[PDB]
Design a protein around this ligand. Structure first.
Ligand SMILES: [C-]#N
Length: 106
């Protein structure tokens, strides 16, 4: 029906731009967004982050207490080393995917 998936998937959320690195397998409903994964990692796995409103949805500004500085941003990637084409509130990871948040300068 127009109800929710029921099948639970596992998405690995990893942050290698920090010491110690963050890596946790997160269980969400199939169809959850990256933002949903962050929320669940926050609820259960001591993950913190900040966003701010944008014209194209929430923009990720800080991860695990580390804010992006000048000419820097938290890049969203799926394994292997592949930037996402959508932001956190749009991309819906598949079962077994690894989502990486990487602090990069431009
Ligand atoms: C935006 N790239």
């Amino acid at each position: 029906d127009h109800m929710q998936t029921q099948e639970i998937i596992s998405v690995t959320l990893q942050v290698l731009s920090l010491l110690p690195p963050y890596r946790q397998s997160i269980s969400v409903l199939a169809g959850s967004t990256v933002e949903d994964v962050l929320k669940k990692a926050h609820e259960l796995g001591g993950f913190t982050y900040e966003t701010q409103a944008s014209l194209s949805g929430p923009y990720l500004t800080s991860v695990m207490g580390k804010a992006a500085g000048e000419r820097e941003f938290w890049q969203l990637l799926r394994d292997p080393n592949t930037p996402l084409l959508q932001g956190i509130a749009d991309y819906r990871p598949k079962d077994g995917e690894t989502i990486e948040l990487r602090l990069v300068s431009w």
